[PDB]
Write an enzyme that holds these catalytic residues in place. Structure first.
Site, PDB file in Angstrom:
ATOM      1  N   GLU A  52      10.691 -37.241  31.880  1.00 28.13           N
ATOM      2  CA  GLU A  52      10.499 -38.545  31.741  1.00 28.13           C
ATOM      3  C   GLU A  52       8.709 -38.896  31.896  1.00 28.13           C
ATOM      4  OE1 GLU A  52      10.378 -41.828  34.035  1.00 28.13           O
ATOM      5  OE2 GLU A  52      12.111 -40.862  35.602  1.00 28.13           O
ATOM      6  N   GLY A 110      19.460 -33.838  36.565  1.00 29.40           N
ATOM      7  CA  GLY A 110      19.339 -33.268  35.714  1.00 29.40           C
ATOM      8  C   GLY A 110      18.429 -31.790  35.201  1.00 29.40           C
ATOM      9  N   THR A 111      17.239 -33.081  36.165  1.00 32.65           N
ATOM     10  CA  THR A 111      16.690 -32.385  35.395  1.00 32.65           C
ATOM     11  C   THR A 111      15.670 -31.016  36.378  1.00 32.65           C
ATOM     12  OG1 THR A 111      15.169 -33.653  34.141  1.00 32.65           O
ATOM     13  CG2 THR A 111      13.738 -32.473  35.138  1.00 32.65           C
ATOM     14  N   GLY A 112      16.080 -31.466  38.142  1.00 35.19           N
ATOM     15  CA  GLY A 112      15.727 -30.820  38.779  1.00 35.19           C
ATOM     16  C   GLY A 112      16.773 -29.390  38.502  1.00 35.19           C
ATOM     17  N   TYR A 161      12.096 -42.163  50.590  1.00 31.63           N
ATOM     18  CA  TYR A 161      11.320 -40.391  50.453  1.00 31.63           C
ATOM     19  C   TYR A 161      10.030 -40.397  50.670  1.00 31.63           C
ATOM     20  CZ  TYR A 161      15.121 -40.964  46.322  1.00 31.63           C
ATOM     21  OH  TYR A 161      16.681 -40.386  46.104  1.00 31.63           O
ATOM     22  N   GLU A 189       5.648 -10.370  54.291  1.00 32.33           N
ATOM     23  CA  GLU A 189       5.969  -9.862  55.302  1.00 32.33           C
ATOM     24  C   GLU A 189       7.407  -9.888  56.003  1.00 32.33           C
ATOM     25  OE1 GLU A 189       2.625  -7.397  57.079  1.00 32.33           O
ATOM     26  OE2 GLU A 189       3.820  -7.230  59.181  1.00 32.33           O
ATOM     27  N   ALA A 210      16.875 -36.670  31.936  1.00 32.51           N
ATOM     28  CA  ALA A 210      18.337 -35.570  31.737  1.00 32.51           C
ATOM     29  C   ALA A 210      19.823 -36.759  31.871  1.00 32.51           C
ATOM     30  CB  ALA A 210      18.578 -34.629  32.439  1.00 32.51           C
TER      31      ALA A 210
HETATM   32  N1  LIG Z   1      13.969 -35.183  49.204  1.00 33.69           N
HETATM   33  C1  LIG Z   1      13.506 -36.003  48.202  1.00 33.69           C
HETATM   34  N2  LIG Z   1      15.005 -35.778  47.155  1.00 33.69           N
HETATM   35  C2  LIG Z   1      14.610 -36.425  46.304  1.00 33.69           C
HETATM   36  C3  LIG Z   1      13.130 -36.876  46.123  1.00 33.69           C
HETATM   37  N3  LIG Z   1      13.476 -37.863  45.222  1.00 33.69           N
HETATM   38  C4  LIG Z   1      14.742 -37.412  44.548  1.00 33.69           C
HETATM   39  N4  LIG Z   1      15.732 -37.332  45.710  1.00 33.69           N
HETATM   40  C5  LIG Z   1      17.116 -36.546  45.034  1.00 33.69           C
HETATM   41  O1  LIG Z   1      17.529 -35.964  44.150  1.00 33.69           O
HETATM   42  C6  LIG Z   1      18.225 -36.257  43.500  1.00 33.69           C
HETATM   43  C7  LIG Z   1      18.463 -36.342  41.903  1.00 33.69           C
HETATM   44  O2  LIG Z   1      17.324 -35.878  41.101  1.00 33.69           O
HETATM   45  P1  LIG Z   1      15.648 -35.958  41.038  1.00 33.69           P
HETATM   46  O3  LIG Z   1      15.022 -35.218  41.166  1.00 33.69           O
HETATM   47  O4  LIG Z   1      15.643 -37.736  41.048  1.00 33.69           O
HETATM   48  O5  LIG Z   1      16.340 -36.104  39.121  1.00 33.69           O
HETATM   49  P2  LIG Z   1      15.826 -35.695  38.545  1.00 33.69           P
HETATM   50  O6  LIG Z   1      14.926 -34.312  38.544  1.00 33.69           O
HETATM   51  O7  LIG Z   1      14.381 -36.127  37.586  1.00 33.69           O
HETATM   52  O8  LIG Z   1      16.213 -35.219  36.428  1.00 33.69           O
HETATM   53  P3  LIG Z   1      16.834 -36.200  35.489  1.00 33.69           P
HETATM   54  O9  LIG Z   1      16.379 -38.060  36.483  1.00 33.69           O
HETATM   55  O10 LIG Z   1      18.132 -36.637  36.106  1.00 33.69           O
HETATM   56  O11 LIG Z   1      16.657 -35.969  35.057  1.00 33.69           O
HETATM   57  C8  LIG Z   1      19.164 -37.008  44.655  1.00 33.69           C
HETATM   58  O12 LIG Z   1      20.075 -36.135  45.518  1.00 33.69           O
HETATM   59  C9  LIG Z   1      17.626 -37.329  45.556  1.00 33.69           C
HETATM   60  O13 LIG Z   1      18.099 -37.678  47.062  1.00 33.69           O
HETATM   61  C10 LIG Z   1      12.545 -37.158  47.121  1.00 33.69           C
HETATM   62  O14 LIG Z   1      11.490 -37.925  45.978  1.00 33.69           O
HETATM   63  N5  LIG Z   1      12.354 -36.505  48.205  1.00 33.69           N
HETATM   64 MG   LIG Z   2      14.139 -38.143  37.142  1.00 31.22          MG
END
Ligand SMILES: Nc1nc2c(ncn2[C@@H]2O[C@H](COP(=O)(O)OP(=O)(O)OP(=O)(O)O)[C@@H](O)[C@H]2O)c(=O)[nH]1
Ligand SMILES: [Mg+2]
Ligand SMILES: C/C=C/[C@H](O)[C@H](C(=O)OC)[C@@H]1C\C=C/C=C/C=C/c2nc(co2)C(=O)O[C@H]([C@@H](C(=O)OC)[C@@H](O)/C=C/C)C\C=C/C=C/C=C/c2nc(co2)C(=O)O1
Ligand SMILES: Nc1nc2c(ncn2[C@@H]2O[C@H](COP(=O)(O)OP(=O)(O)O)[C@@H](O)[C@H]2O)c(=O)[nH]1
Ligand SMILES: [Ca+2]
Ligand SMILES: [Mg+2]
Lengths: 420, 440, 59
Positions: free
Chosen positions: B71, B144-146, B224, B254, B99
């Site tokens: 997105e 869902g993306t991460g 964040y 190393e 996702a």
């Molecule tokens: N440390 C940190 N954690 C984050 C941040 N943004 C999201 N999170 C964590 O990431 C998780 C949610 O995943 P996201 O990365 O926001 O979702 P996404 O990867 O965009 O996937 P979708 O939006 O579902 O398509 C949660 O556990 C949040 O606490 C950030 O900027 N810093």
């Molecule tokens: Mg997202």
């Protein structure tokens, strides 16, 4: 991420009108569709519910439906009547007469295709369509019958989109019509199968709030709708303003619906007419629930809480933790961290700070048991069935709706008794 | 040469990328427009900062990075942010529909629509490298993306780049800032799928970072932005050996040789010190011995666990700033006699030390005080298996009732993938038990 | 060195094949779930036709 709004029937159009008045005020939109706000946060996600037109006009992405013109004629005469798109008015003449069969199989089946044309027109121009939200009642004919017909036909052309419904549950304390237990059960039979998330707006809870809490001798429909509009504004705050939690209909459903059939939510609001601990306590109180169910008679599967206004987010975090610890017995252990909280700095109109509650509680069976009790009282003696069989239905279909709704209650009780 | 490509996936990965590259630019004296006055070699170079930055003919220093999100909201802020001139538009890749916190949509339904374009853009960066070393993948476990898209990408990268090294920076979920109930599911699914495609993964527990921001920086409700700015310091300490060069500098590979005794045991525990506010750093100078001793306080770890109740398989100290070996050796000797540092019997107990004389840097208007010397400890300890245990327990609670599983099955997945992924985690927990047992 | 080449190549092959298997199985499962959803909705339309027909016959 656009949402297509649909309001059907008398109740659907009246609460739908109020909903657009409230959020238009929040986003700074006047009855002419012009923006005269003072904060860019009002426009950041304005496309979720509004289409932009010539002259920087914001037109609600709403479709008004009814089998009789009177209720919709009042909308066009209402405060924001001129803001709606005139071509999005789709009405008939025969009416429904509080007959679910007429709305679902007969009169509504004739008008349904003309409504679908407006859906495709609106949905085609969406950059990324979220889905649809429907406002209607389950105790009438058009909203209950044709509203559930539209859900099935829309889901046939948009099977990968979210279907949300603001369903108004009938109560003898507000309406004396006797065939409402039939229309409600037949509709619930359809909502269990073809909707992803449904807000239960119980008129019995609205009446009891207006009478006992608000101290209203004779609650008018305008009094009940004041609670509905305030509730609908709260449950859609996460969709209309920049937010992290439950920002769209699918992410909400993922956090709220652990099992597909158990998607009937219990709304709550506070204050009903103040500190963060008090807001948190009233928010989980049975007297502030827009569904006539006691959450302490069941267990929470999932909960979404929305705080609005300027307050200490550290205090909100502490109190939401405090209520979960002091009431752990009422949260299922097999769904860890099932309570999510969002905070929006922009409070509603006329309030310093508010709190909106969205609960998926097994205690919602109390609402389906009440309708089932009123249903079987008339069906065991086959009363008033000629109004439905005359339109083509058969007794078999009535028994299926009865058993399917009884199965829903059995499933809510199943996960209430489940242990880790 | 020895270029490293960074891939930032999802909101967490992208927003952490913003903190890391902003910090990188400040460390190397690169302006938001990419100009670097100290770089006298225009259009190119072989300096140490060229492992992370390419150079255009116009003197712009361009990150060797790709940002991917299903997105556009998060990456749009980069396209219009302070460092928007830093990246070519093709490095910032966005979809339209995310996702929805669903691994299936990230790995299959939505992800398959953009995976080819992402690999094509990654290929364009690899073609600019004279000797590509590997990839750095930033992502969350919960999203869902991460989770879903990262797994898909890691699989594809193993095909398109063989056994070229791939390191992860993974955001372990915490209830204080989590946004989905199914994050345990997405965590176990992505960890199972990426285990054989990752060579080294640095987990970051948001609750650990959350507590550090509250405890050491007096932030009532960290955001964040607070967490990411702290995370960027750990990431900077880990990559400093690749971006700078010095006599006492020790390359990350190393350290990697010492940190990974078996392919599946590639999850080092990170501990960073000093994390102190400006008000408390005023007239208080923390020595080498003090910051080194803080590396063995469990409250300073990136992942919540107790290494006192586990066994060490490796211990690395990455110093930066005003630090000399004499002070380091003395601090280590004092620590050996006053800490619960138990090694497994098949590992030498020495501490591997690296020093980068470039002092730590802080982002302006931040919460971290600017200190003369900092340290990041990378240790391989069985105690990190506790992080798997807590997460696997949450998975078991929901999956015993199949809660939310229909959201994954509806997108094409099968229950067999859930049981298969959970079994791999059980073997991983058992693997960390076996490595700690004494030999015959 | 031949063994190292063969092992790296076999790893790439297994991964490439493992993935194409999952992506195809996922495509078939999702399509099957949607086809079942539509088939049930299409049976509601057939029932609606019988209901309107059943009304026509009574008269
Ligand atoms: N440390 C940190 N954690 C984050 C941040 N943004 C999201 N999170 C964590 O990431 C998780 C949610 O995943 P996201 O990365 O926001 O979702 P996404 O990867 O965009 O996937 P979708 O939006 O579902 O398509 C949660 O556990 C949040 O606490 C950030 O900027 N810093
Ligand atoms: Mg997202
Ligand atoms: C004659 C009686 C005189 C009484 O002394 C006295 C009165 O009247 O003087 C003042 C009270 C006044 C107190 C309260 C009123 C209550 C109304 C209830 C009501 N229920 C329906 C309609 O009104 C309904 O449900 O009708 C359906 C139609 C409809 O709903 O469209 C209008 C149809 O279209 C829908 C089909 C699915 C067809 C199906 C069933 C109808 C049952 C009749 C109920 C009834 N109770 C009273 C009067 O009738 C009564 O008790 O009245
Ligand atoms: N809260 C609320 N409920 C309403 C309103 N109008 C009708 N209802 C309820 O809707 C039910 C009747 O359905 P109705 O909408 O009037 O019939 P329809 O026109 O065929 O949809 C009754 O149980 C009423 O209590 C309203 O304005 N507000
Ligand atoms: Ca140069
Ligand atoms: Mg009416």
């Amino acid at each position: 991420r656009e949402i297509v709004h649909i309001q059907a029937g008398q109740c659907g159009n009246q609460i739908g009108a109020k909903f657009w008045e409230v959020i238009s005020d929040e986003h700074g939109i006047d009855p002419t569709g012009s923006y005269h706000g003072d904060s860019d946060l009002q426009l950041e996600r304005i496309n979720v519910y509004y289409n932009e037109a010539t002259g920087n006009k914001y037109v609600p992405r709403a479709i008004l439906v009814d089998l009789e013109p009177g209720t919709m004629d009042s909308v066009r005469s209402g405060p924001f009547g001129q803001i709606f798109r005139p071509d999005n008015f789709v009405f008939g003449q025969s009416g429904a007469g509080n007959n679910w069969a007429k709305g679902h199989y007969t009169e509504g089946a004739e008008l349904v295709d003309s409504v679908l044309d407006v859906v495709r027109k609106e949905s085609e121009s969406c950059d990324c369509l979220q889905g649809f939200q429907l406002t209607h009642s389950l105790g009438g004919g058009t909203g209950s019958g044709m509203g559930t017909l539209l859900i099935s036909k829309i889901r046939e052309e948009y099977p990968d989109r979210i279907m949300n419904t603001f369903s108004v549950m009938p109560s003898p304390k507000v309406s004396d019509t006797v065939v409402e237990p039939y229309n409600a059960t037949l509709s619930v039979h359809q909502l269990v199968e073809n909707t992803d998330e449904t807000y239960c707006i119980d008129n019995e809870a609205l009446y009891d709030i207006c009478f006992r809490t608000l101290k209203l001798t004779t609650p008018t429909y305008g009094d009940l709708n004041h609670l509905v509009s305030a509730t609908m504004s709260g449950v859609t705050t996460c969709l209309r303003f920049p937010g992290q939690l439950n920002a769209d209909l699918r992410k909400l459903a993922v956090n709220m619906v652990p099992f597909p059939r158990l998607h009937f939510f219990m709304p709550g609001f506070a204050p009903l007419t103040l500190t963060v601990p008090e807001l948190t306590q009233q928010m989980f109180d049975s007297k502030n629930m827009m569904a006539a169910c006691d959450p302490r008679h069941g267990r929470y599967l999932t909960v979404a809480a929305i705080f609005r206004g300027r307050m200490s987010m550290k205090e909100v975090d502490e109190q939401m933790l405090n209520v979960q610890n002091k009431n752990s017995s009422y949260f299922v252990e097999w769904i860890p961290n099932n309570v999510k909280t969002a905070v929006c700095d922009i409070p509603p109109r006329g309030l310093k700070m508010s709190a909106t509650f969205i609960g998926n509680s097994t205690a919602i069976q109390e609402l389906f048991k009440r309708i089932s009790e009123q249903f079987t009282a008339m069906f065991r003696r086959k009363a008033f069935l000629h109004w439905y069989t005359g339109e083509g239905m058969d007794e078999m279909e009535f028994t299926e709706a009865e058993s399917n709704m009884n199965d829903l209650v059995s499933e809510y009780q199943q996960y209430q008794d489940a242990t880790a | 040469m020895r270029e490293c490509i960074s891939i930032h996936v999802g909101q967490a990965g992208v927003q952490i990328g913003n903190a890391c590259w902003e910090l990188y630019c400040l460390e190397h004296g690169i302006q938001p427009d990419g100009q670097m006055p100290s770089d006298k070699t225009i259009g190119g170079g072989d300096d140490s900062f060229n492992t992370f930055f390419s150079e255009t003919g116009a003197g712009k220093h361009v990150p060797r990075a790709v940002f991917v999100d299903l997105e556009p909201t998060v990456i749009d802020e980069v396209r219009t942010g302070t460092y928007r001139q830093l990246f070519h538009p093709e490095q910032l890749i966005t979809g339209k529909e995310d996702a929805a916190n669903n691994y299936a949509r990230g790995h299959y339904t939505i992800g398959k629509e953009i995976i080819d374009l992402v690999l094509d853009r990654i290929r364009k960066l690899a073609d600019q490298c004279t000797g590509l070393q590997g990839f750095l993948v930033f992502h969350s476990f919960g999203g869902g993306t991460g989770s879903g898209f990262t797994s898909l990408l890691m699989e594809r990268l193993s095909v398109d780049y063989g056994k070229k090294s791939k390191l992860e920076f993974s955001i372990y979920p915490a209830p204080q800032v989590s946004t989905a109930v199914v994050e345990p599911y997405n965590s176990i699914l992505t960890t199972h799928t990426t285990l054989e495609h990752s060579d080294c993964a640095f987990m970051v527990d948001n609750e650990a970072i959350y507590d550090i921001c509250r405890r050491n920086l007096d932030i009532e409700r960290p955001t964040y932005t607070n967490l990411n700015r702290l995370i960027s310091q750990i990431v900077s300490s880990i990559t400093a050996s690749l971006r700078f060069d010095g006599a006492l500098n020790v390359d990350l590979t190393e350290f990697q040789t010492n940190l990974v005794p078996y392919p599946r045991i590639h999850f080092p525990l990170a501990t960073y010190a000093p994390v102190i506010s400006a008000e408390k750093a005023y007239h208080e100078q923390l020595s080498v011995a003090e910051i080194t001793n803080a590396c063995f306080e469990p409250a300073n770890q990136m992942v919540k666990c107790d290494p006192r109740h586990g066994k060490y398989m490796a211990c690395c100290l990455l110093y930066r700033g005003d630090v000399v070996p004499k002070d380091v050796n003395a601090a280590i000797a004092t620590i050996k006699t006053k800490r619960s540092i138990q090694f497994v019997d098949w590992c030498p107990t020495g501490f591997k030390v690296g020093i980068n004389y470039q002092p730590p840097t802080v982002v302006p208007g931040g919460d971290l005080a600017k200190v003369q010397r900092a340290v990041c400890m990378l240790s391989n300890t069985t105690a990190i298996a506790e992080a798997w245990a807590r997460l696997d327990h949450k998975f078991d609670l929901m999956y015993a009732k199949r809660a939310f599983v229909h959201w994954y099955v509806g997108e094409g997945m099968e229950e067999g993938e859930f049981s298969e992924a959970r079994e791999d985690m059980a073997a991983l927990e058992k693997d960390y038990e076996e490595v700690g047992v004494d030999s015959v | 060195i031949q063994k190292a080449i063969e092992e790296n190549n076999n790893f790439i092959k297994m991964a490439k094949e493992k993935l194409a298997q999952k992506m195809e199985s996922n495509k078939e499962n999702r399509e099957a779930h949607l086809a079942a959803m539509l088939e049930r909705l299409q049976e509601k339309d057939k029932h609606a036709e019988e209901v309107r027909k059943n009304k026509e016959l009574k008269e």
